Paper text:
We noted that position 2 on the quinazoline ring of 3 presented a vector towards Cγ of Y550, positioned on a flexible loop above the enzyme active site. We designed tethering compound 4, which we predicted would undergo Michael-style conjugate addition to the acrylamide from the free cysteine thiol introduced by the mutation Y550C. In order to direct reactivity of 4 with BtGH84 to the desired site, a triple mutant (Y550C, C420S, C654S, hereafter BtGH84_TM – signifying triple mutant) was expressed. In the absence of an inhibitor in this structure the active site is occupied by ethylene glycol. Compounds 9 and 10 attempt to coordinate the water seen H-bonded to H433 in the structure of BtGH84_TM-4, potentially stabilising the conformation seen in this structure and reducing linker mobility. The quinazoline ring is seen stacking onto Y137 and pointing towards the active site, with the amide linker coordinating a water molecule with Q551. The varying position of the tether in these three structures demonstrates the flexibility of the linker, however the fragment is in each case centred on the π-stacking interaction with Y137 (ESI Fig. 9†).
Residue numbers in the entry: 4 to 599, 602 to 618, 622 to 648, 659 to 696, 706 to 716
Write the structure that this text describes.
C-alpha cells in the first residue's frame, strides 16, 4: 500500500530486479537529499558507465530532459518510472524529487520493483503537524524522530508551538532561547531541512502583548534571533488568550508589519501564518466583525488557521465554506486530533476520519495537533499525511492499519489489538468522541441483555468475549516487552498495564457467570476485588499529571460490559444465597454515607478526595466522608461543616465565600472524617505522598 497513494499510478504485472550494475545520470545535479536516499538504496550495487540507466533530476536538469512532458507541473510534483529498460525519478522541483525517492523506497521489496509509471503531486499545499498542545512538550529525541517520519510521508510542515515552552508563550516570548535550547533548535532546523520539512517557529505573545513600539520591536528581534538559528518560516498565534491581544485590527497590522519589514526583506522566508483568537465557528462573535476584519486587512500571502465549527471538530464542506467567505482566502486547517491535552488519562490511537475528502481546493494547509505522546501520535500523523496528500483516495481503515504496520512491524497485530480499544476520549467539555471496540460491541450488547433478563446467552457471544480478553492479555504482554520502538512502549506502558488488568478482570467475571459452585464463585469474586484494587493503584501512581491524572483504557464498551456483568452476577448471587456481597465496580479506600448524594461515588485525584458532581437537602440531613486514615488537611472547597479524627469529637470549620465558591483552609489539622449538615463541587485536599 503506497502511502500516501499517488495521484496517478499504472502498474504492469511484471517485476525487475534492482539492477546489480547501474548507470546514474543526474547524481551531481539533483536534490542532494534525494540523491542520498537513492545511494543508500543502491548501497550493495555497482556504479558503472554501462548497466541499467537510472536518471534523477528536477525539471531543467540535463539528466531528465527526455522526460519533461511527463513531469507534473505542480509544486512538489514528480514522475517516477520503472521498466526493464530504465528507472526515472524526476521532480518538478527539488522537493518533488525527494518525494519521488520516498515513493521509490516503498516500491522496492526483496530487491525487486514493479514495472510502474507514476505521476504524483499533493492536493493540499501545506501538510503536517502543529506541536501546539498543553502539557509536557516533545523531547528533543522525539522531535528528531518526528522529522524523519514527516519526510517519509511527504509532510512538508512542522509548526513549533508547545504551549508550555516559556520562550514560545507566557512569560518569556520576548527573550532569546538560552544557549542549550538554541543549539537544539538549530539541530531541529537542520534535520527538518534534510527531510524537506519547513520548520515553522511560532510565537504566542498575546496574553501580555502591548500594542506599542517596544513589544513590536522585541517580537521582530526574537524572529531575527530565530532566523539566525536557521528558521525560515514563522507564525504568530493569538489562540486561548483574553484582553487587548485579541484586537483584530492590531493583530492584522502586526502580521503585515512582520511581512513588510521581515518576510519581504529576507531572501528566503517561506510560510507566514497566524492563528486567530476566534479560531472556530462556535467561538466567533455572531454580531461582530473579528473575522471579516482579519480577512480584509491581513496581507493576502499570510495564512489564517482554523479548527472547524468547534474547538475540536472535523472539517466539513459547509464549515470550510463558512470560514473561507469571511477570511477571503482558503483556511489553513489546525485539526485538533489526536491531541489529548484535555483528556490526559486517555490515549487516542484510533483511525483518522470525519474530514471531507473533496475540499482540497478549499484549504491552504492541513496540520494535526498531536498528543504529548509523540510516537503514539504517529498513527494519526501517518493518516493525516495520507489524507492531505490525496484526499480523494483517502481510505481511513486501510491507512490506520498501514500506519500501525509501519510503526511497529514486529508486533503490528498486538498494537492493533491495543489501539482498537484505546480510541474514544470519554465524556468531555468539547463533546468530541470517537468510535471504539465496534467489532465486539454487538456480541457484548446481546450477551448483556440475555444475562440481565431470564435468558440463555449465545455460547458464541460468550466465547467472543473470552476470545477478546485472551487476545488483550497476549497483546499487552507482547507490547510490554517489545524493543523495536522502545520510546513507543515507554509512552503506552501505563495503559498497557491497565489494559491487561481489564482483560484479567473480564476473564474472572465471565468465570463468575459460568456459575459452577458457591466456593468457586467466591474465589472469583475475591480475585476480581483484588484486580479492582490493582487498577486503582495504577490509576493513582501512573500519569499523575495536573489536569486528568491516571490511566483509563477500553472505556467505551469493554469496561462498562465487565462492570455491568459483575454488578448483575453479584446481585443474582446475593438473591440466590441470601448473601450480601458488595457490587461496587471501582475500588475506593475511603467511604461516604449520606441521608441525601448517597450514591454519588467518591473519587481520588492526586491529594484530593471528592464527591462526583438539582439536589433536595432536608433539614438536619448530612453527608459524611470517612478517609482510610488520618491525614493533615489542606483545604475544603464546596460549590452549591465539621471535621474529626475519631468520628465522635468534632470541630467546626467556617467557610468563606466569593460568589458560589465556599472554601476553608485546615492549616494541617488532622482529618479522618468530614461532615456537612444543611453539588457542582465537594473537594477535600489533604497532605499526601
Ligand atoms: C490542565 C492544564 C490546562 O488546563 N491548561 C490550559 N491552560 C491554559 O492557559 C495557559 C496558561 C488554557 C487557556 C485557554 C484554554 C485552555 C487552557 N488550558
Ligand atoms: Ca537540479
Amino acid at each position: 500500500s503506497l502511502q500516501p497513494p499517488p495521484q496517478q499510478l499504472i502498474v504492469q504485472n511484471k517485476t525487475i530486479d534492482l539492477p546489480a550494475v547501474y548507470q546514474l545520470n543526474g547524481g551531481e545535479e539533483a536534490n542532494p537529499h534525494a540523491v542520498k536516499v537513492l545511494k543508500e538504496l543502491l548501497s550493495g550495487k555497482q556504479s558503472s558507465k554501462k548497466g541499467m540507466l537510472i536518471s534523477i533530476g528536477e525539471k531543467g536538469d540535463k539528466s531528465v530532459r527526455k522526460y519533461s512532458r511527463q513531469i507534473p507541473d505542480h509544486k512538489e510534483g514528480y514522475y517516477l518510472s520503472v521498466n526493464e529498460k530504465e528507472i526515472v525519478l524526476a521532480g518538478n522541483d527539488e522537493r518533488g524529487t525527494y518525494y519521488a525517492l520516498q515513493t521509490f523506497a516503498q516500491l522496492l521489496k526483496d530487491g525487486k520493483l514493479p514495472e510502474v509509471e507514476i505521476k504524483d503531486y499533493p492536493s493540499v499545499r501545506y501538510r503536517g503537524v502543529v506541536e501546539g498542545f498543553y502539557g509536557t512538550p516533545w523531547s528533543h529525541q522525539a522531535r528528531l524522530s518526528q522529522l524523519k517520519f514527516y519526510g517519509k510521508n511527504k509532510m512538508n510542515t512542522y509548526i513549533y508551538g508547545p504551549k508550555d515552552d516559556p520562550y514560545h508563550s507566557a512569560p518569556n516570548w520576548r527573550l532569546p532561547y538560552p544557549d542549550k535550547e538554541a543549539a537544539q533548535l538549530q539541530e531541529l532546523v537542520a534535520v527538518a531541512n534534510e527531510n524537506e520539512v519547513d520548520f515553522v517557529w511560532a510565537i504566542h505573545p498575546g496574553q501580555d502583548i502591548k500594542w506599542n513600539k517596544e513589544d513590536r520591536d522585541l517580537l521582530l528581534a526574537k524572529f531575527e534571533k530565530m532566523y539566525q538559528l536557521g528558521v525560515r518560516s514563522f507564525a504568530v498565534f493569538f489562540d486561548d488568550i483574553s484582553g487587548e491581544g485579541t484586537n483584530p485590527q492590531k493583530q492584522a497590522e502586526l502580521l503585515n508589519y512582520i511581512d513588510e519589514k521581515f518576510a519581504q526583506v529576507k531572501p528566503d522566508i517561506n510560510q507566514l501564518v497566524m492563528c486567530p483568537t476566534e479560531y472556530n465557528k462556535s467561538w466567533s462573535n455572531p454580531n461582530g466583525n473579528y473575522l471579516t476584519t482579519l480577512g480584509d486587512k491581513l496581507n493576502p500571502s499570510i495564512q489564517i488557521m482554523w479548527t472547524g465549527d468547534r474547538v475540536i471538530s472535523d472539517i466539513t464542506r459547509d464549515g470550510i465554506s463558512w470560514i473561507n467567505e469571511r477570511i477571503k482566502r482558503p483556511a489553513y486547517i489546525w485539526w485538533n486530533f489526536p491531541v489529548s491535552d484535555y483528556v490526559r488519562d486517555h490515549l487516542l490511537l484510533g483511525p483518522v476520519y470525519g474530514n471531507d475528502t473533496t475540499i482540497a481546493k478549499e484549504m491552504s494547509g492541513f496540520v494535526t495537533n498531536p498528543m504529548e505522546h509523540a510516537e503514539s501520535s504517529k498513527i494519526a500523523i501517518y493518516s493525516v499525511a495520507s489524507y492531505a496528500w490525496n484526499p480523494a483516495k483517502y481510505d481511513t481503515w486501510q491507512t490506520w492499519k498501514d500506519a500501525i504496520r509501519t510503526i511497529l512491524p514486529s508486533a503490528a497485530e498486538e498494537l492493533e489489538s491495543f489501539a482498537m480499544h484505546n480510541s474514544d476520549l470519554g465524556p468531555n467539555g468539547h463533546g468530541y468522541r470517537r468510535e471504539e471496540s465496534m467489532d465486539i460491541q454487538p456480541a457484548a450488547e446481546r450477551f448483556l441483555k440475555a444475562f440481565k433478563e431470564g435468558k440463555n446467552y449465545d455460547k458464541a457471544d460468550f466465547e467472543t468475549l473470552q476470545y477478546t480478553f485472551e487476545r488483550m492479555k497476549e497483546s499487552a504482554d507482547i507490547l510490554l516487552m517489545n524493543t523495536e520502538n522502545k520510546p513507543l512502549i515507554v509512552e503506552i506502558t501505563p495503559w498497557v498495564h491497565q489494559f491487561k488488568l481489564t482483560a484479567e478482570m473480564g476473564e474472572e467475571v465471565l468465570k463468575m457467570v459460568e456459575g459452577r459452585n458457591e466456593s468457586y464463585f467466591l474465589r472469583k469474586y475475591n480475585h476480581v476485588k483484588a484486580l479492582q484494587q490493582q487498577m486503582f493503584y495504577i490509576d493513582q501512581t501512573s500519569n499523575q499529571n495536573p489536569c486528568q491524572p491516571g490511566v483509563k483504557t477500553a472505556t467505551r464498551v469493554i469496561k462498562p460490559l465487565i462492570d455491568r456483568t459483575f454488578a448483575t452476577v453479584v446481585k443474582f448471587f446475593n438473591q440466590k444465597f441470601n448473601a450480601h456481597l458488595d457490587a461496587t465496580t471501582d475500588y475506593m479506600p475511603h467511604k461516604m454515607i449520606s441521608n441525601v448524594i448517597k450514591n454519588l461515588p467518591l473519587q481520588v485525584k492526586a491529594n484530593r478526595v471528592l464527591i462526583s458532581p438539582v439536589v433536595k437537602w432536608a433539614a438536619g440531613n448530612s453527608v459524611e466522608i470517612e478517609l482510610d486514615a488520618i491525614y493533615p488537611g489542606e483545604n475544603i472547597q464546596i460549590n452549591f461543616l465539621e471535621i474529626s479524627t475519631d468520628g465522635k469529637e468534632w470541630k467546626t470549620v467556617d467557610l468563606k465565600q466569593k460568589e458560589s465558591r465556599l472554601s476553608a483552609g485546615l492549616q494541617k489539622a488532622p482529618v479522618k472524617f468530614v461532615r456537612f449538615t444543611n453539588l457542582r463541587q465537594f473537594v477535600l485536599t489533604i497532605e499526601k505522598k
